[PDB]
Amino acid sequence: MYSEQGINNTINISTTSLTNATQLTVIGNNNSVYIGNNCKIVSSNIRLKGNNITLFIADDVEIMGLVCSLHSDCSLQIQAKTTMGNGEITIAEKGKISIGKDCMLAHGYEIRNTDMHPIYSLENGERINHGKDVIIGNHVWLGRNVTILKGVCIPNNVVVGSHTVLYKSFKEPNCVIAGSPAKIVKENIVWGRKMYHSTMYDDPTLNEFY
Amino acid sequence: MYSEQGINNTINISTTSLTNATQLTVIGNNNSVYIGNNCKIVSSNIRLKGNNITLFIADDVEIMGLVCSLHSDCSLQIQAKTTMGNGEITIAEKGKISIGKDCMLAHGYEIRNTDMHPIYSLENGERINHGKDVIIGNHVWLGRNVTILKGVCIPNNVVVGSHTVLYKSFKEPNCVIAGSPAKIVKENIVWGRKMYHSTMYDDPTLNEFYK
Amino acid sequence: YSEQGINNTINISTTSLTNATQLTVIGNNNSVYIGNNCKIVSSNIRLKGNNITLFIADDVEIMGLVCSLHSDCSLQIQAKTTMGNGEITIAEKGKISIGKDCMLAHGYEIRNTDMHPIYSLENGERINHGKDVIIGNHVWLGRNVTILKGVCIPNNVVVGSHTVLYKSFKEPNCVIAGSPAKIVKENIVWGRKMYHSTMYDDPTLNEFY
Ligand SMILES: CC(C)(COP(=O)(O)OP(=O)(O)OC[C@H]1O[C@@H](n2cnc3c(N)ncnc32)[C@H](O)[C@@H]1OP(=O)(O)O)[C@@H](O)C(=O)NCCC(=O)NCCS
Ligand SMILES: CC(C)(COP(=O)(O)OP(=O)(O)OC[C@H]1O[C@@H](n2cnc3c(N)ncnc32)[C@H](O)[C@@H]1OP(=O)(O)O)[C@@H](O)C(=O)NCCC(=O)NCCS
Fold this sequence. Notes:
homotrimer; mainly beta; UDP N-Acetylglucosamine Acyltransferase, domain 1; eight-stranded mixed beta sheet; flat; binds coenzyme A
């Protein structure tokens, strides 16, 4: 699975977490990987190339089929209880992506803080697509094949509809966002994981949202 | 071939149909699987877990790489001569999805009567995204990577354009639906399978759609 | 490769890499030219039919292309173009042309054909005949872009990720995105490397100003 080449790399994967069929590659220096405890990080391909990169996955995170590329001085922070299917996260330009607590990311997600190539204005010659941090709030549910691009911030307890592309940030919590261009399509809601909970009151994990 | 667990489960797969490389799993009671004559249901993964589940696939249906998950009291019905490439069909909340005669589904389809997870109103705590049935009419062609969500009904003789997401129903037949949001972009058409034909009149399977 | 039929000509430069690539040619009078210093890896290229042409110029890099060509079709890819994983389909005796120094990100789908007919009820005639696709020089396709029949893209254009193009554009030097597809930013030029504060530091970009 794991493969390192470089100096002063710190890799602590809790011994209670599972990493079956996962590939971890670290090329470079002064990097840190932190996983566990009670994590299931399976069939993924995670790549850190450079210096001073931080990968932080908190307790109780379940990821399956993530392809992840991090360049120098980048950091990926995924908070506890977050679940993630197949997808891709790319970070470059010494930026950050953070994913809050108790998120649910369905298969097909694509998350990035960068276009990986420059676009310049012919008017003044300046670059106009610098990378920008992605912040994904607590208790966010991304439907299938959602794409989250650079600089986008998602509030807490928000649902993003299947196949939506987000180019811009939103400020309102407790809403559903869908369509193209992306927009608030429903307000004043809260989502849960279990359909067998008839009401939000039957879900202990939701107490805080109401 | 298939793995079956439980009581009063019935499985009828015609001996003239091919199921090469397909896994069929049925767990529960009172479930029924039917696959008619001269079908090719290949490289597929089909799961029935629960009670009173129905899977009915008529004659001359060809399916390649279907991933299909059905739960209790759910039913999937696919009528004769329909062809399907790689894709996913998910049915829960005791609902139903039906696919009509002579449909053509290109690789990439995602079809569901359900969101799989509850959305509650903050006003009164009630669930407001209950599952809803899906009905795909006769002679519907789905282009590549089309997504059909809960409650969607598609009229007969319709083409859905590549990468279209349908979140609500349409009523107009004989049209092309595409874009986002999904809308009728062309009217008064009929589609066929074979590019070699000069005109619709040359395709006997299309007689019923223009009279 | 795997070549079967009469008078097929396959010329792949000895300076080019084809690691893990399946090239299958079934039919007659087909021709494949791949130029110098190419890397065509982990791809699956199928020519099924007769009188098909595939021309790939120098310094082209392709990783994970699934390509299907039918009789009398042609695919041309000009020098210095790079392409990730994706799919190209040509039929109805048509052609697709990709210009110089393009950059095609993972998930592209490019086709000159719908593969099945649509007829008008007014007269029974087919209204969706295949139509050539032309991608200009120095075009950058973001992730998961879909290019449908008849589409012509001007030089020096960026196509935003997940965009579907159904219609041609005329304006060079722009960003195209959204649905429907529209010009979302004018008067730009893209580059490959981000270690350049301005466009004047990229020698490759001079011909655009
Ligand atoms: C996000 C989602 C859960 C919200 O569903 P919902 O709360 O029941 O709300 P709806 O989807 O019916 O739509 C709410 C409104 O937005 C509209 N809307 C939905 N999708 C839209 C689209 N893509 N473009 C424009 N409007 C859209 C609806 O028409 C509706 O309008 P209305 O107020 O007039 O009724 C659901 O839309 C969805 O994307 N389902 C897929 C979930 C999924 O991918 N699960 C798989 C594994 S996690
Ligand atoms: C659905 C499809 C077959 C329709 O073909 P068509 O009859 O020639 O349709 P057109 O390209 O002429 O488009 C019809 C109209 O809708 C518009 N349109 C098509 N797709 C659109 C979309 N993505 N968003 C917005 N508008 C769209 C067109 O611009 C056109 O508008 P206009 O007539 O006012 O100029 C074609 O769009 C398509 O999706 N082809 C790919 C099919 C495929 O996946 N094949 C392989 C799997 S079987």
